[PDB]
From a paper:
Two crystal structures of the CAP domain of pathogen-related yeast protein from Saccharomyces cerevisiae, Pry1CAP, are presented. Our previous studies revealed that Saccharomyces cerevisiae CAP proteins are required for the export of sterols in vivo and they bind cholesterol in vitro. The sterol binding and export properties of these proteins are localized to the CAP domain, which is sufficient to rescue sterol export properties of cells lacking endogenous Pry proteins. The overall monomer surface area for Pry1CAP is 7125 Å2 and its topology is an alpha-beta-alpha sandwich made up of 6 helices, 2 disulfide bonds, 12 beta turns and 1 beta bulge.
In the second structure Mg2+ is coordinated by the CAP cavity tetrad residues. In one Pry1CAP structure, a magnesium ion from the crystallization solution is coordinated by the tetrad which results in a slight shift in the histidines when compared to the structure without the divalent cation. The CAP cavity tetrad residues of Pry1CAP (His208, Glu215, Glu233 and His247) superpose well with the corresponding residues from representative CAP proteins8111329. Electron density for four 1,4-dioxane molecules were observed in the initial molecular replacement 2Fo − Fc maps when dioxane was present in the crystallization solution; this density is absent in the Mg2+ structure, which does not have 1,4-dioxane in the crystallization solution. The observation that EDTA inhibits cholesterol binding and that addition of Mg2+ restores cholesterol binding by Pry1 is surprising since the cholesterol binding CBM and the CAP tetrad that binds Mg2+ are located at distinct sites in the Pry1CAP monomer. The cholesterol and Mg2+ binding sites are distinct and unconnected in the Pry1CAP monomer. Mg2+ dependent sterol binding by Pry1CAP requires the interaction of both binding sites, likely occuring via dimerization, because Pry1CAP forms dimers in solution, and both crystal structures have a crystallographic dimer in which the CBM and CAP tetrad are connected within a large 7063 Å3 volume cleft. Pry1CAP is a dimer in solution and the cholesterol and Mg2+ binding sites are connected by a large cleft in a crystallographic dimer, providing a structural basis for Mg2+ -dependent sterol binding by Pry1CAP.
Numbering used by the authors: 159 to 299
The structure:
């Protein structure tokens, strides 16, 4: 794996191990080809829009690879494990730790000095299935 791929995969697994019964991810070359193509074509507008593809997806603007994973994960501060499910400010975290997700692949592209890096990670199987959060988003162990 490349330095970007290794550091990003490692950051996912460092976080997932903090949670009960959550296995590590592996890198997928096909997922990364998908994500890097979307990163290649990103319009550097400052707006984050999902690709609408078949995989799970996390997006960030202004962080390198590992720092993006860190920011996604830090949404745990808004997650109420007593009331699991989706919210606009927890969906990145729940995809990072989604138990049934087994593979991740990501891409990156600079958007200049005013935006920093655009980072997209694609996930297979996808996370954030409504009604399945309790089975796939475990509490801190
Ligand atoms: Mg996103």
């Amino acid at each position: 794996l490349s330095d970007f791929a290794s550091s990003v995969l490692a950051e996912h697994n460092k976080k997932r191990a903090l949670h009960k019964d959550t296995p590590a991810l592996s890198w997928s070359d096909t997922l990364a080809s998908y994500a890097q193509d979307y990163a290649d074509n990103y319009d550097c507008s400052g707006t984050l829009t999902h690709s609408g593809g078949p995989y799970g997806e996390n997006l960030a603007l202004g962080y390198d690879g590992p720092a993006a994973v860190d920011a996604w994960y830090n949404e745990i501060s808004n997650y109420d494990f007593s009331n699991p499910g989706f919210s606009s400010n927890t969906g990145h975290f729940t995809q990072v730790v989604w138990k049934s997700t087994t593979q991740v692949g990501c891409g990156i592209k600079t958007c200049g000095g005013a935006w920093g890096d655009y980072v997209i990670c694609s996930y297979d199987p996808a996370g954030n299935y409504e009604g399945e959060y309790a089975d796939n988003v475990e509490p801190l162990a």
